[PDB]
Design a protein around this ligand. Structure first.
Ligand SMILES: *[C@@H]1O[C@H](CO)[C@@H](O[C@@H]2O[C@H](CO)[C@@H](O)[C@H](O)[C@H]2NC(C)=O)[C@H](O)[C@H]1NC(C)=O
Ligand SMILES: COc1ccc(NC(=S)NCCCn2ccnc2)cc1OC
Ligand SMILES: [Zn+2]
Length: 298
């Protein structure tokens, strides 16, 4: 029943798909664009801004952007991406199309396509709300290590853990983190036993949409298997606080990952479209079905 809005998606992606290393002009423009976009989609918007010294550049100002609908709800579904792009000395024009402009565009477009629900009937409840989290400073400035990585996520997890209104971080039922989406024929495996039921939901929704003739082409992206390895990402500081994670990161990685080829020209629209159809229904169904607190901390 939920229709595509590809005009919105495209125009959103165009607005984000600019060089946006933390501290750059493009990063500032994207931050402002995210905040404006969230406000216009009906979210209560907050920015978690902070300074931190990193390799190469010294002190930089980071800002996570968080939008919430039903901020006084008991629990939250949280959907996330990173909005910074990776600094490359020899590639100042790097735009990280899959990493993670498309992921961020997907979250905003999910909010757009379900707007008739999110901005109306969904507001009339106290059991669940929706959080969209745009992490800053996911990328290493010199070399990915536990230290040089995920600066925004580290800060936001600490912030959410340090507040009570139970701890704010504890009201997050699951962190659904989208990364490395946009390439052709992506494959998503379940990383964690505790969110396998949610993964199974994605699989079932994709099967159902295919049977209804609603998917483009012949690939299925949601695999019914547990992945044998893990991908380090923005959810690490949330694991550290026992938050359940559904990690929607394609493996294998896009061919273009961390190369000058991670651009608009190498995106695969039919895959993006299929992702959006499954994902928007997954989010709607999670919210629609919710009654009691979902407790996947096991
Ligand atoms: C959203 O953007 C994509 C990418 O530019 C558009 O897909 C292109 O559409 C034109 C017209 O059909 C084709 O000639 C190109 O081959 C497509 N390019 C790619 C990379 O797929 C799509 O049309 C846009 N959607 C809307 C609604 O404007
Ligand atoms: C080249 O293929 C891979 C390379 C590395 C890893 N493993 C990890 S733990 N990477 C951390 C990625 C952090 N990140 C996310 C977005 N931008 C940076 C897995 C790969 O294939 C499964
Ligand atoms: Zn990256």
């Amino acid at each position: 029943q939920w229709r595509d809005d590809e005009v919105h998606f495209n125009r959103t992606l165009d607005s984000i798909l600019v060089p946006r290393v933390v501290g750059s002009r493009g990063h500032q423009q994207v931050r402002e664009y995210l905040v404006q976009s969230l406000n216009g989609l009906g979210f209560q918007t907050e920015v978690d801004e902070f300074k931190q010294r990193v390799p190469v550049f010294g002190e930089l100002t980071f800002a996570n952007v968080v939008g919430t609908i039903n901020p006084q709800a008991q629990n939250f579904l949280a959907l996330a991406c990173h909005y910074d792009s990776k600094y490359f000395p020899n590639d100042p024009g790097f735009v990280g199309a899959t990493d993670s402009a498309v992921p961020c565009a997907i979250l905003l477009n999910t909010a757009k396509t379900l707007g008739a629900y999110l901005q109306k009937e969904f507001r009339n409840r106290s059991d669940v709300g929706l959080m969209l989290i745009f992490f800053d400073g996911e990328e290493a400035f010199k070399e990915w290590t536990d230290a040089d990585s995920v600066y925004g996520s580290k800060h936001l997890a600490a912030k959410l853990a340090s507040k009570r209104s139970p701890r704010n971080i504890d009201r997050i039922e699951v962190l659904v983190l989208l990364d490395l989406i946009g390439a052709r024929n992506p494959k998503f495996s379940s990383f964690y036993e505790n969110t396998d039921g949610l993964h199974s939901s994605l699989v079932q929704i994709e099967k159902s949409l295919r049977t209804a003739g609603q998917l483009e082409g012949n690939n299925n992206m949601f695999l019914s298997r547990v992945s044998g390895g893990l991908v380090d990402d923005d959810h690490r500081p949330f694991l550290d606080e026992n938050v359940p994670v559904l990690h929607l990161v394609a493996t294998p990685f896009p061919d273009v990952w961390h190369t000058p080829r991670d651009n608009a020209a190498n995106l695969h629209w039919p895959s993006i479209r299929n992702f959006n159809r499954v994902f928007r229904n997954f989010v709607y169904q999670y919210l629609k079905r919710h009654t009691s607190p979902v407790n996947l901390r096991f």
